[PDB]
């Protein structure tokens, strides 16, 4: 039983806290506002059964924005290869990745 | 970082003073004291009233926790709704106090 009293009576009891793409105070965007807006506008109206297979790209984009697992795995690979080349002496860091370059602005 | 250093300094000063208080007069070689209370050995009687004032504290402190964002909530653009809900929270705290009154909850610690 989902007695949709809110849509029937036209009141907004809890839809505002439901998603990150909703109206936030002082127009603060979430860090994955665009990804969630794209996933919601993809998966709207077509049902969950169609939405699990027809909006997989937007949902993988949004999940990887949220958790950043592919990003952190890529950073793990870059940093670990960098540490191996430092340990082998095949590589040196640049001066701008050591703190001796007087940052931009 | 300055705050963590300050907390560590205050804890270290307190522990140093407590160690001096618990170990400087131990070096006194005074005397061994042979055979070192209104109730003799009876058990502690449970007071229902102390527990009642503690739970009344806890519930009104939860209502305080709801009231704590009000200096930030006065800055909103939806001020009629904000003012209504603020007066409604303080009114429900007052209704909690009135019900605690009239059902003899504030008795012998009034």
């Amino acid at each position: 039983p989902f007695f949709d009293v809110q849509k029937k009576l036209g009141v907004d009891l809890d839809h505002w806290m439901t998603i990150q793409s909703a109206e936030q105070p002082h127009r603060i965007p979430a860090r994955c506002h665009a990804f969630e807006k794209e996933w919601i506008e993809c998966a709207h109206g077509i049902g969950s059964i169609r939405a699990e297979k027809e909006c997989k790209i937007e949902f993988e984009d949004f999940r990887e924005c949220l958790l950043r697992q592919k990003t952190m795995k890529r950073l793990n690979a870059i940093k670990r290869q960098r540490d191996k080349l430092i340990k082998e002496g095949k590589y040196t860091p640049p001066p701008h990745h050591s703190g001796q370059e007087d940052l931009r602005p | 970082m300055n705050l963590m250093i300050t907390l560590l300094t205050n804890f270290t000063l307190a522990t140093l003073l407590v160690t001096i208080a618990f170990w400087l007069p131990q070096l006194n070689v005074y005397s061994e004291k042979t055979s070192p209370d209104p109730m003799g050995s009876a058990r502690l009687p449970f007071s229902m009233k102390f527990f009642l004032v503690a739970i009344t504290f806890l519930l009104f402190d939860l209502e305080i926790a709801l009231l704590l964002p009000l200096p930030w909530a006065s800055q909103t653009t939806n001020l009629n709704t904000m003012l209504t809900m603020a007066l409604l929270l303080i009114f429900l705290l007052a209704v909690s106090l009135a019900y605690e009154w009239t059902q003899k909850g504030l008795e012998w610690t009034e």
Binding site: - | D37, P38, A42, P45, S47, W108
Partner: protein
């Protein structure tokens, strides 16, 4: 069906009300001067 394990179980009371199964005595002594024996009920 009473077994060996469920043999010490008696049926519950009929009104389902069980029997519940002392007040504090203080000695405010000499430590003018007066000794007091208090029977307090809280």
């Amino acid at each position: 069906y009473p077994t060996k394990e469920t043999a010490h179980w008696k049926p519950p009371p009929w009104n389902d009300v069980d029997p519940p199964k002392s007040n504090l005595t203080l000695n405010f002594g000499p430590q003018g001067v007066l000794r007091l024996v208090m029977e307090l009920s809280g």
